[PDB]
Design a binder for this molecule. Structure first.
Ligand SMILES: C[C@]1(Nc2ncnc3[nH]c4cc(F)ccc4c23)C[C@@H](O)C1
Ligand SMILES: [Cl-]
Length: 167
């Protein structure tokens, strides 16, 4: 039993809700919140901009130190950093950005990072400003993640379409 509330159950391990991931993280304080990161951990917009704003820019300060030490992530890769006031940890995961021409096949590799964590609150990778089809992202999530994932979908219209079209 966990503290996530109001989710629709899609499969044995995947759950979905129309919610603002920022507000959901603040309420649940999950062990792991996933960020829709880029390789530079520049949290300017989309989910990343919203999460970083909610940390009062502390996420960005920590991220800049991480990059100065380690260099950029790989597309499809991840790193674990602090969750600040939102979660114990933040798993920064880089899905391919279609608006940059990146290989959509890397979306499966991106979701594989979730399997290193027993339970996660997450957005759909590569959705939103990353330009991929969210219906496809949900399919890859369900077919790749084996740990327990609670997906927050900000847009109500998109949420209803994801549910109604789910096979
Ligand atoms: C992939 C999508 N991104 C989000 N998913 C979950 N929670 C979110 N909160 C946000 C706050 C913001 F200021 C900007 C984007 C998001 C966002 C779902 C769809 O709407 C684009
Ligand atoms: Cl977005």
């Amino acid at each position: 039993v966990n503290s996530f509330s109001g989710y629709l159950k899609l499969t044995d391990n995947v759950y979905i809700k129309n919610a603002d991931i920022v507000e959901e993280a603040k309420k649940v304080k999950p062990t792991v919140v996933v960020n829709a990161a880029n390789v530079y951990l520049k949290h300017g917009g989309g989910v990343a901009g919203a999460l970083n704003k909610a940390t009062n820019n502390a996420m960005q300060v920590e991220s800049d130190d991480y990059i100065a030490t380690n260099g950029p992530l790989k597309v499809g890769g991840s790193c674990v950093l602090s969750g600040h006031n939102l979660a114990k940890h933040c798993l920064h995961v880089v899905g391919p950005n279609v608006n940059k021409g990146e290989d959509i096949q890397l979306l499966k590799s991106a979701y594989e990072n979730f399997n290193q964590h027993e339970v996660l609150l997450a957005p759909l990778l590569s959705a939103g400003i990353f330009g991929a089809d969210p219906i496809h992202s949900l399919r890859v999530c369900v077919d790749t993640v084996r740990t327990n994932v609670y997906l927050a979908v900000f847009d109500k219209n998109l949420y209803d379409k994801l549910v109604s079209s789910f096979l």
